[PDB]
Amino acid sequence: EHTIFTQLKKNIPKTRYNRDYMLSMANIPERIINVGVIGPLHSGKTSLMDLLVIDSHKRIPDMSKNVELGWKPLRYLDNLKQEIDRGLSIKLNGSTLLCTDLESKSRMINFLDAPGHVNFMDETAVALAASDLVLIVIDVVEGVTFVVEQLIKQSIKNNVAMCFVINKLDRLILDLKLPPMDAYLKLNHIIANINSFTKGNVFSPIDNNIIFASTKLGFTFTIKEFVSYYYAHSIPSSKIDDFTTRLWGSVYYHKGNFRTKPFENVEKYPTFVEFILIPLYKIFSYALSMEKDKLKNLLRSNFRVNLSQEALQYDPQPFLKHVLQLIFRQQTGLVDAITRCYQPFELFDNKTAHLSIPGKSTPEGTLWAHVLKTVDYGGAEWSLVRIYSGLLKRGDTVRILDTSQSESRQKRQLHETPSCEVEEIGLLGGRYVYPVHEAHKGQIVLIKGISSAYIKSATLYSVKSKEDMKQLKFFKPLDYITEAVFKI
Amino acid sequence: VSTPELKKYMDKKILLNINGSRKVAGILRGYDIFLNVVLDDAMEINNHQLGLQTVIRGNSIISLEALDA
Amino acid sequence: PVNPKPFLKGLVNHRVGVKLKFNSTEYRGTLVSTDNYFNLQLNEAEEFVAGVSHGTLGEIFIRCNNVLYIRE
Amino acid sequence: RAELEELEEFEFKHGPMSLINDAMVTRTPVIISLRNNHKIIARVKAFDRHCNMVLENVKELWTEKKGKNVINRERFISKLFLRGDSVIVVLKTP
Amino acid sequence: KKVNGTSYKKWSFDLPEMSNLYRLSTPLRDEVTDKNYYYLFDKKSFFNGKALNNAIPGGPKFEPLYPRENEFNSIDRVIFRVPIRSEYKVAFPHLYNSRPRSVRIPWYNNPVSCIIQNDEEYDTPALFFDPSLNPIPHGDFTLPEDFAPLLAEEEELILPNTKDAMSLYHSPFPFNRTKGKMVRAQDVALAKKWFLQHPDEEYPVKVKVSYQKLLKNYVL
Amino acid sequence: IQVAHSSRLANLIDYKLRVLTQDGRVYIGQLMAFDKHMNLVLNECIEERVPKIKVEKRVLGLTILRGEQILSTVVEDKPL
Amino acid sequence: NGIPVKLLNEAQGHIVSLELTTGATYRGKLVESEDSMNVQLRDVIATEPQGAVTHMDQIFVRGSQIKFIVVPDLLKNAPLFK
Amino acid sequence: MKLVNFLKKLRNEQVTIELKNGTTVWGTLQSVSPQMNAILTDVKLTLPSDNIASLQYINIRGNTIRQIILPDSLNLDSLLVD
Amino acid sequence: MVPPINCIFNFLQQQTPVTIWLFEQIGIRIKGKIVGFDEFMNVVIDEAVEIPVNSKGTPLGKILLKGDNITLITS
RNA sequence: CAUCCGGGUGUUGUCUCCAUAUUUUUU
Numbered sequence A: 001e002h003t004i005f006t007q008l009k010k011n012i013p014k015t016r017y018n019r020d021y022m023l024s025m026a027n028i029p030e031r032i033i034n035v036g037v038i039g040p041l042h043s044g045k046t047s048l049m050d051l052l053v054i055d056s057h058k059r060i061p062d063m064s065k066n067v068e069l070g071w072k073p074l075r076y077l078d079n080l081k082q083e084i085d086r087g088l089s090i091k092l093n094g095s096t097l098l099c100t101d102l103e104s105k106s107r108m109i110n111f112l113d114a115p116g117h118v119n120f121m122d123e124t125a126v127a128l129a130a131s132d133l134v135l136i137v138i139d140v141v142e143g144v145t146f147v148v149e150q151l152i153k154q155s156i157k158n159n160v161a162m163c164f165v166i167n168k169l170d171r172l173i174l175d176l177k178l179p180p181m182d183a184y185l186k187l188n189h190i191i192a193n194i195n196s197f198t199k200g201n202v203f204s205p206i207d208n209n210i211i212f213a214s215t216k217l218g219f220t221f222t223i224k225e226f227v228s229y230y231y232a233h234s235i236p237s238s239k240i241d242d243f244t245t246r247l248w249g250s251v252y253y254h255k256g257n258f259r260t261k262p263f264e265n266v267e268k269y270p271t272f273v274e275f276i277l278i279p280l281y282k283i284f285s286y287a288l289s290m291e292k293d294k295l296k297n298l299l300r301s302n303f304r305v306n307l308s309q310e311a312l313q314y315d316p317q318p319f320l321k322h323v324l325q326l327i328f329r330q331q332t333g334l335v336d337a338i339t340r341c342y343q344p345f346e347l348f349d350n351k352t353a354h355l356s357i358p359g360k361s362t363p364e365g366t367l368w369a370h371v372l373k374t375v376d377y378g379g380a381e382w383s384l385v386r387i388y389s390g391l392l393k394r395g396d397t398v399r400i401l402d403t404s405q406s407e408s409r410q411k412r413q414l415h416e417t418p419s420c421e422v423e424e425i426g427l428l429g430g431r432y433v434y435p436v437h438e439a440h441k442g443q444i445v446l447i448k449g450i451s452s453a454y455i456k457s458a459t460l461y462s463v464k465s466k467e468d469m470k471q472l473k474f475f476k477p478l479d480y481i482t483e484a485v486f487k488i
Numbered sequence B: 001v002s003t004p005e006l007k008k009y010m011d012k013k014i015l016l017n018i019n020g021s022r023k024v025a026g027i028l029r030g031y032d033i034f035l036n037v038v039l040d041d042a043m044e045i046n047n048h049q050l051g052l053q054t055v056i057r058g059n060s061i062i063s064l065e066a067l068d069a
Numbered sequence C: 001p002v003n004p005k006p007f008l009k010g011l012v013n014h015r016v017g018v019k020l021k022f023n024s025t026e027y028r029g030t031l032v033s034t035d036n037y038f039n040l041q042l043n044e045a046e047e048f049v050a051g052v053s054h055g056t057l058g059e060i061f062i063r064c065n066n067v068l069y070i071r072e
Numbered sequence D: 001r002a003e004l005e006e007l008e009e010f011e012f013k014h015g016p017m018s019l020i021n022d023a024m025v026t027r028t029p030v031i032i033s034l035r036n037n038h039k040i041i042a043r044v045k046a047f048d049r050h051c052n053m054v055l056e057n058v059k060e061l062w063t064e065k066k067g068k069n070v071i072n073r074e075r076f077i078s079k080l081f082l083r084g085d086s087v088i089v090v091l092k093t094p
Numbered sequence E: 001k002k003v004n005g006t007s008y009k010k011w012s013f014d015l016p017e018m019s020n021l022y023r024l025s026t027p028l029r030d031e032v033t034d035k036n037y038y039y040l041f042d043k044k045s046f047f048n049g050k051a052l053n054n055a056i057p058g059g060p061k062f063e064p065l066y067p068r069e070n071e072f073n074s075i076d077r078v079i080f081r082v083p084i085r086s087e088y089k090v091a092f093p094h095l096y097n098s099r100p101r102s103v104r105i106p107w108y109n110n111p112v113s114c115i116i117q118n119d120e121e122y123d124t125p126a127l128f129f130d131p132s133l134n135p136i137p138h139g140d141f142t143l144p145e146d147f148a149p150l151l152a153e154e155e156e157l158i159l160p161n162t163k164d165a166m167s168l169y170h171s172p173f174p175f176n177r178t179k180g181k182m183v184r185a186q187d188v189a190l191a192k193k194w195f196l197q198h199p200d201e202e203y204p205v206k207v208k209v210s211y212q213k214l215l216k217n218y219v220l
Numbered sequence F: 001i002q003v004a005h006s007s008r009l010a011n012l013i014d015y016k017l018r019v020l021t022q023d024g025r026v027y028i029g030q031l032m033a034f035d036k037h038m039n040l041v042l043n044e045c046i047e048e049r050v051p052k053i054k055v056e057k058r059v060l061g062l063t064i065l066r067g068e069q070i071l072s073t074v075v076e077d078k079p080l
Numbered sequence G: 001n002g003i004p005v006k007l008l009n010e011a012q013g014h015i016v017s018l019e020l021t022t023g024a025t026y027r028g029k030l031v032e033s034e035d036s037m038n039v040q041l042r043d044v045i046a047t048e049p050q051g052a053v054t055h056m057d058q059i060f061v062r063g064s065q066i067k068f069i070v071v072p073d074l075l076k077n078a079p080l081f082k
Numbered sequence H: 001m002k003l004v005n006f007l008k009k010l011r012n013e014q015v016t017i018e019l020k021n022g023t024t025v026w027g028t029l030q031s032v033s034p035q036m037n038a039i040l041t042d043v044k045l046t047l048p049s050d051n052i053a054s055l056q057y058i059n060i061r062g063n064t065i066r067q068i069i070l071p072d073s074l075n076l077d078s079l080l081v082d
Numbered sequence I: 001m002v003p004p005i006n007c008i009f010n011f012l013q014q015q016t017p018v019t020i021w022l023f024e025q026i027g028i029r030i031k032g033k034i035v036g037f038d039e040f041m042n043v044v045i046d047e048a049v050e051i052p053v054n055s056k057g058t059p060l061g062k063i064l065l066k067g068d069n070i071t072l073i074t075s
Numbered sequence J: 001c002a003u004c005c006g007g008g009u010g011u012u013g014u015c016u017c018c019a020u021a022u023u024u025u026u027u
């Protein structure tokens, strides 16, 4: 009646990457990264999360034949009767899973999908308080609207690194029917409009900051990823990265010679149109409108993609999705961009200083975590907590102080707390909860049993001596971004 | 091409182990892709300084240890 | 301005003395030619074993990797 | 690949690589000092960039010296491949 | 090739046959391609209308299902401002009326469509910058020769059958498919989309009431 | 000891391999990964030095062996 | 790219041991690695070839000098191989 | 110009080898790499005054190989030309 | 920041008192002044002097020393 | 709470038509 949720533990999805090796990488605190997926309403962030979910698991049981074929999107993290019927994420949900970058180094990432409607900004304020970096997903048709502008101003305010995913790239092609040069000018307009609100930092597709994606057709790429697949087995290997820095922004190419003027003879396009964008238009046009016998030969010769004999008998939209998922493989370019965005050394200290009264340090022995919200997740209620320091074990009694007390308790520390035992700890996964015995520093978990101790948020601390009581500093309460002003 | 990330160790004193059990103390001035250490010369292993500003070759490096934290 | 490779090009057709690393010996003969690798060739090269001419080797071709230093 | 081999043979003939190339052309016995002390008297057959050289008519000369007993040892081989790094000084015997 | 056999159970066509059947069946196509057309005429607004006993201005009218009919909503104390007309009570049905019994929640929106059609003269290409659209205002390094992008050997971006593909790509049900199975002849409801869309023009009273009666039958 | 008449090194991967080293030691274990520069990744590497009498023995587990400091490779035993 | 060097960089963070050409072993948290194994460690014990242990905070090493690196049992599992 | 061509063309020949230390190696040329790595099947080793240590299979590192004593029935000029 | 190429360009123009240590070698040092520079680390040194180590001033002149066997430089 | 016009998929049978190298690897 309320959620769609996986209650039988035996019916869990079967996790291609061996979750025990995922939990083993939680010991190193630099291996974990917390990213929240924010953006505007109906821009694609849930389907973007759903791509990663589909590619991370072996057999999802809730996946029907239609969401395999690509007619209806599996909205895996929507999960509620509200969010299925309304068609709208109203509560934040997440998934913790491991992902590999382009250099094959795997790391554990905690994705928090957040709502995009503007009434639900309490949720987005929770996601900005949780996340190390955010990946703002915007759609290409609307541009960087006023909502996008406010989301990047709040990403700057919270001392949070950020990344951009240009979404809905098919609507340039199929819906609006723009020519490839005009769509290049549209993309350069969006990026040059992104850089106007960002104070000083530079977002370009060649700095692993801008990621082009469909998520209805189910691809994503970067210029670095797209050179790394099909181009850079031909370039001499000392030139590869330098060639990628040639792939943007009014540098023109003819016959092995790069220059900047329009070259006056061949009437070619700029290099991003010629190398990346026109092959993308050709993949779409030839998937939808070329006879399959020529298409499988051409596509085997160019991309080494072998179209199966089943996949010739499709409808045009599943066939386009199938071709585009075989040209553009699993989302390693996005994960590589996430790894290249976040430096912990620059921003973890400023983020804890912004959340809670800048001190020198916390002792490594004490347990110090931040109970963000009470979330009804799977029948019973779980707290949702990020662990800033120390270790937490199942069966440990800790002090949970409500955050409204904290602005007084902090001045009293400059000049009692009720305790609760941690009954269960689980990793959030979408339609399920994976039970875990202990939770380390730097990761986001769900804790059953402390929910009766606070209203909206809390801080969780376990002190070892008496002397570290004066060292510890409490979290300030949230800036739920919109003031509630509509009364009944 | 892969630049050894010595910008964490830039402008800091370092105990450079080099060929034949020889040590070099000295604050770092710069470097290159071959790991050739450009450093302000200090006492060489009781102890005695040779030179004012030194450039050690990468091939001769055994190690370089963080004297300063 | 006096670099090694242009002085080496001037040192062509001139007497040179070669010293090496391990199991090594000084020499003394007229340099014939050189390349970017610094492979040497001498005529009338005398095998100065620690500054003592053990034998007049004459027409010889020295390898590049074992070279330590070259002098007058 | 072809232009590099053209400038290879060009740079051999003019540079000092011509010497033992001319020794191979004249096909004489040549002595070569070695890293592990072996004066190799042999007929040069092959010749490359790295100074790796196949040797016909081989006659290695050395001294297996241990026990206060100088036993100047030597052996004949039919054909042998030389690695470059082992070489110290090649020389053509007049 | 175009059928399984004389048992006549499954069908699969090419693109030009399917496009030809798309053009040829113009008078009975749906020709509504965005889902925001059915804002307050979807099935679930009809269910909320039956349950709440309201009448959206062009649809059916049922019985109450709760036919039996304090000083909280008195006149002195409520601020009369922006009347609470029946479309608001249908759209947000837990906020605008007390006691919503047997009410379900009706799919907030679909984003905004900007599909552009191309039907004039056919000689315009597939990819063309429409007049509706706003404008978008404002040697150390070399590679080997014969280095060219991926599909440069096939020089045409726009194939001839691709305008038909981009038109069939958006058609609602039977035509975006090109593969399927045979149904019965009476199971193909040809008049059905007509009374689900709206009245096409301004009709007589009898013809506007006929839409409502058939549309009530669909809801039941 | 038994082994197939193999063509190259990569074809006999995951075989228990005696691997000599320039410093005098020998590393014995099942090889997981090789390289262009002969860097090796032994699954169950075992450190065996030859001291100046009888063999020195020590267990390592999963270890990278750098290629430059290898002398040669020898097949010790089969997989599994 | 070198699949053993791939493994090394993936092994960053774990308590890894390291012996050089000199024969002096090390053991601590890894920090940095590259194509040429330009290794960095934290909390590193530095046992000399004789056996003289000297605990120290950090170290940087050049790849030419490295002999072999003791990786833990976690990299046996995933995800570099398949 | 490449002797690597010749050494590649040397196949299935039983040959002696010397190393940097000077170890002998009697075995069939299974294959030779472009950087001299001598892949050898059916091999026999003897150290430098020392007794026999015969083995089944050995691929030896290219740089460690000092000097390969070739067999008797061998036309050098036949393989040198393309 | 100063790469080795730029610090040796200072040693090139200055020609100040250089002391060189040698690769795979503890028994001997050099004392002269830098005069040349190659794209490799080869440098010709005028007024060079062979200086055995403090466990004297022995004879040596101007030398093109193959720079791949260098350890120290300090002008 | 039932009746009726229909539908999918699987296994077996049956029927029809054809067929038998010049600093980290290696100079």
Ligand SMILES: Nc1nc2c(ncn2[C@@H]2O[C@H](COP(=O)(O)OP(=O)(O)OP(=O)(O)O)[C@@H](O)[C@H]2O)c(=O)[nH]1
Residues within 6 Å of the ligand: A040, A041, A042, A043, A044, A045, A046, A047, A048, A073, A075, A087, A088, A089, A114, A115, A116, A117, A167, A168, A169, A170, A171, A213, A214, A215, A216, A217
């Ligand atoms: N035309 C088109 N639609 C897309 C594309 N990607 C996603 N969508 C649609 O966008 C709608 C919104 O998708 P969601 O991801 O579920 O919405 P959201 O981003 O989570 O925004 P929320 O309402 O907060 O969930 C879905 O109905 C998708 O069909 C695309 O590339 N092209």
Ligand SMILES: [Mg+2]
Residues within 6 Å of the ligand: A045, A046, A088, A089, A113, A114, A115, A116
């Ligand atoms: Mg959503």
